[PDB]
Amino acid sequence: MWVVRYQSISFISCCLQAFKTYSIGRSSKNPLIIKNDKSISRQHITFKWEIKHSSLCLVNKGKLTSLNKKFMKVGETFTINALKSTIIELGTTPIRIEFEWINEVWNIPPHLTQFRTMLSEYGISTEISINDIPANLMISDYPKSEDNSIRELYALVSTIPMKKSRFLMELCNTLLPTSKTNLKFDEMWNDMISNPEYNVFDFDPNILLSKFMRLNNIRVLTTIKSEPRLSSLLRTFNINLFAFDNIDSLYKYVDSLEASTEYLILTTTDKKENGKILCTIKTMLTSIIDGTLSAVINMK
């Protein structure tokens, strides 16, 4: 997303909506007024971007406007590319205006498809396949989520932060139209992003992953042919992952394994059977984060 920010001193910030032609000046008719500076024209500078690749297009309408020390001629068109921030200095006393590209890509559940267009209109990208280039935010409704979902698994192991879906809907419903009405986008974002009632879990991502190390050296034996083929996610935690065509083929292996060998079995279903204890991803996750794994591993 594109954020612009500048400047009783009032810190103003605002999320740039695509295709809208924005403008900074002293004239009241601007979306973003700079007060208290005569070096600032009626309409001093304008800009709009459209759907990396989401570059910003600016055109200087004011007397003094400097980008990285090179000075715009009145009317000159210049652009800012979609790293870090970029600042353009305006006026005699330089008023420093900052344009940041915050490449936000969110992984969302399918029922929230109705919000994708809006999110993209404000530079928040969404995805449904866990794809390959990681996302920075996983919208998830765990524990109210499919029992053999790999999504929470993928994010927990990828230290991607997980937030309830109301976070997504509150952002679109509230802080988006309001950031316009009060030029404090940055404060709202950081309230919403640090507000705990949108958190799925009680610990920071990397702390969550820390609870994932008691796996240590253990055999994980599974009936599940998964999206990012599981073994990948768990190659991280350096764990012997073993897959079987039907729970038959897996029960075979247990007899072959020596006694007092530790294993758990990740199956379609939570239930005890043949003395052994069979669990699913969601139960394994939960026992890990809770620490109650012991009541789920078996030994031979």
| DSSP 8-state class, residue 216 | S
Chain CA centroid to CA 102, Å: 11
Instruction: Enumerate the H helices of 74-220 as residue ranges.
Output: 116-121, 151-157, 165-170, 176-182, 185-194, 205-210
Tell how strand 240-243 and strand 262-266 pair up.
unpaired
Look up residue 36 and give its two tokens. 């208290």
Task: Say what the resolution is, in angstroms.
Answer: 2.4
Question: What single DSSP character describes residue 87?
Answer: E
Q: What is the dihedral of CA 206, 211, 214, 218, to 10 degrees?
A: -80
For the chain, which residues make up each domain, given as ranges?
2-101, 104-206, 212-299
Provide the experimental method for this PDB entry: X-ray
The whole-angstrom separation of Cα 142 and Cα 162 is 9
Under CATH, which number does the domain 104-206 receive? 3.40.50.10190
Within 10 angstroms of residue 152's Cβ, the number of other Cβ atoms is 25
Cis peptide before 143 (omega within 30 of 0): yes
**How many angstroms separate the CA atoms of 176 and 100, rounded?**
17
Beta-carbon neighbour count of residue 250 at 10 Å?
21
CATH classification (class only), 2-101:
mainly beta
Query: Phi first, then psi: what are they for 178, rounded to 5°?
Result: -85, -40
